[PDB]
Write a protein that binds this ligand. Structure first.
Ligand SMILES: *[C@@H]1O[C@H](CO)[C@@H](O)[C@H](O)[C@H]1NC(C)=O
Ligand SMILES: *[C@@H]1O[C@H](CO)[C@@H](O)[C@H](O)[C@H]1NC(C)=O
Ligand SMILES: *[C@@H]1O[C@H](CO)[C@@H](O)[C@H](O)[C@H]1NC(C)=O
Ligand SMILES: *[C@@H]1O[C@H](CO)[C@@H](O)[C@H](O)[C@H]1NC(C)=O
Ligand SMILES: *[C@@H]1O[C@H](CO)[C@@H](O)[C@H](O)[C@H]1NC(C)=O
Lengths: 224, 49, 49
């Protein structure tokens, strides 16, 4: 429902390789150009992973403050969770439970289900506080989970503007679990905030690096 | 007078003399991509073996 | 005769004019051999010739 035309954004670095002034082609798991994303907005239903998720919360948003990842979302299969407390990020690879709509003198700490059976933790800097557009790319291939963001100000708060956005690796995380279905986090402060979900599959891109060696333009195969 | 002018902006008659560097150059270049070929061995560089 | 994270090899090492990503280790050629590395225990970036 509510098929929104996701135009161009969603390209990312594979990995090692600095080059410059090159016209080079790669082959990984990719998000389609001109694809449709169901618009979301109060309302936050459940989503599956389906081998790759392009998360993009809207600008003029201060609501989404974390994520719950997993396969079953039970106390059996190892789960994953990140929380920004406005000065750090709190990565939990612990075991958790079910909460239908957790959220955040402004109140917090309602969100947590259970803190038993932890496997891994990580602490780093917070990501970032007409706004710098939050974008995230989620994938796990045999353990290595990765972080991607490129935050850019524009108008047109709901609909995605055109342009170009390479996705830059931030935290590579070798966990080694399964991910099939997940849920983001919200913050009910007494509420329809927008975000988008993408999908990856092995299509074929074509990359161009500039003289600085940064992606500026890219095309795919099955478009035309 | 016209013989520089037909060849001034871009004539369609440079052609054979331009690509004869170029198809040679990719023939050089397609020899270079074969270094990164693998042939069922588990590497391309010798040092990984 | 270098050895960076197990990749042996031979060449002359020099400081990089390149700008390296910050998430990275190996710059690789059309020939599919290493051209630019980052030190396994330093943050400096070295061009391999
Ligand atoms: C995306 O949605 C629009 C409008 O619903 C539709 O016209 C278009 O065919 C959809 N894209 C694909 C690939 O089906
Ligand atoms: C945590 O989960 C793992 C699953 O591999 C299990 O082996 C272990 O016994 C669990 N520990 C506790 C304290 O429940
Ligand atoms: C994923 O596949 C199944 C459950 O989906 C399980 O056997 C396997 O351990 C999982 N992979 C991991 C976490 O190594
Ligand atoms: C590379 O980035 C620098 C920093 O802004 C800029 O001055 C330079 O023009 C860029 N290179 C090109 C080819 O635009
Ligand atoms: C290894 O040496 C490097 C120096 O660059 C340092 O980063 C690391 O902490 C050292 N490890 C030790 C002393 O085991």
């Amino acid at each position: 429902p509510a098929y929104t035309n996701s135009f161009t954004r969603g390209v990312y670095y594979p990995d090692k390789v600095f080059r410059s002034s090159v016209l080079h082609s790669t082959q990984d798991l990719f998000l389609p150009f001109f694809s449709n994303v169901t618009w979301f907005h109060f309302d936050n239903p459940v989503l599956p992973f389906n081998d790759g998720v392009y998360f993009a919360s809207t600008e003029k948003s201060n609501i989404i403050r974390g994520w719950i990842f997993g396969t079953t979302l039970d106390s059996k299969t190892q789960s994953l969770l990140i929380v920004n407390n406005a000065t750090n990020v709190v990565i939990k690879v612990c075991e958790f439970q079910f909460c239908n709509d957790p959220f955040l003198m402004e109140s917090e700490f309602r969100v947590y289900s259970s803190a038993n059976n932890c496997t891994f933790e990580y602490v780093s800097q917070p990501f970032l506080m007409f706004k710098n557009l939050r974008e995230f790319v989620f994938k796990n291939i045999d353990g290595y989970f990765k972080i991607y963001s490129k935050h850019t100000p524009i108008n047109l708060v709901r609909d995605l503007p055109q342009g170009f956005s390479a996705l830059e690796p931030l935290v590579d995380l070798p966990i080694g679990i399964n991910i099939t279905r997940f849920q983001t986090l919200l913050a009910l402060h007494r509420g329809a905030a927008a975000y988008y979900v993408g999908y990856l599959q092995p299509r074929t891109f074509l990359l161009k690096y500039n003289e600085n060696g940064t992606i500026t333009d890219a095309v795919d195969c099955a478009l035309d | 007078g016209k013989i520089q002018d037909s060849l001034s902006s871009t004539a369609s008659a440079l052609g054979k003399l331009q690509d004869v560097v170029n198809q040679n150059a990719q023939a050089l270049n397609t020899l270079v991509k074969q270094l990164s070929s693998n042939f069922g061995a588990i590497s391309s560089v010798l040092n990984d073996i | 005769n270098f050895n960076f994270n197990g990749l042996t090899g031979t060449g002359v090492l020099t400081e990089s004019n390149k700008k390296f990503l910050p998430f990275q280790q190996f710059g690789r050629d059309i020939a599919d051999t290493t051209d630019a590395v980052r030190d396994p225990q330093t943050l400096e970036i070295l061009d391999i010739t």
